[PDB]
């Protein structure tokens, strides 16, 4: 009598996991693009 609820929960958990995964990737990508810009800017400021 609990298999239905469990399956529904598992479906929602899969949605939760993917969204969390995507959010984390977006955070990593954001950090990465920002760090690259900083390094480029920083190197140039120091060379010239």
């Amino acid at each position: 009598q609990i298999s239905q609820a469990i399956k529904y929960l598992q479906n929602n958990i899969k949605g939760f996991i993917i969204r969390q995964r995507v959010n984390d990737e977006m955070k990593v990508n954001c950090a990465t693009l920002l760090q690259a810009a900083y390094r480029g800017h920083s190197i140039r400021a120091n060379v010239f």
């Binding site: 298999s3 609820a5 469990i6 929960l9 598992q10 929602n12 958990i13 996991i17 969390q20 990737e25």
Partner: protein
């Protein structure tokens, strides 16, 4: 809406080919906000000859599939905390409102549409587990449904 979903699509399109592997469809649907079963995703694919024969799908094709199956997909975003209270009751017969990580893993990986341990571990990264190794399942459900 589309801008955010377009960027999610771009994120999935690793090869920047304007199309993602058909096998990633369910995850893209999850990424944009739905909670379909793997079965619903297959039924959607198998019902459309173009989709069924495709190796990859463009954003246009996906936007089209969503339109067609919008009612069924929207239905996957209606779960309520109470819909799972009894499931946890099986592991909290004394109604403490808490369950151990062990029992959560058992329920998720040994019952229903069995999830893998890797899925549960990824899940646990976004779940609040106290120093006692126990979870308030009402809060847990809320976070899961939170969106």
């Amino acid at each position: 809406a589309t801008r955010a979903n377009k960027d999610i699509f771009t994120l999935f399109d690793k090869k920047g080919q304007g199309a993602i592997a058909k096998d990633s469809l369910g995850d893209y649907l999850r990424a944009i906000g739905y909670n379909p079963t793997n079965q619903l995703v297959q039924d959607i694919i198998n019902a459309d000859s173009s989709l069924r024969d495709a190796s990859s799908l463009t954003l246009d094709q996906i936007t089209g599939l969503i339109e067609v199956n919008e009612k069924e997909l929207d239905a996957t975003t209606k779960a309520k905390t109470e819909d799972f209270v009894k499931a946890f009751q099986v592991f909290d017969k004394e109604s403490t409102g808490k369950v151990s990580v062990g029992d959560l893993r058992y329920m998720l990986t040994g019952l229903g549409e069995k999830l893998t341990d890797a899925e549960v571990d990824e899940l646990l990264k976004g779940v609040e587990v106290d120093s006692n190794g126990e979870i308030d399942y009402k809060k847990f459900i809320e976070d899961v449904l939170r969106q």
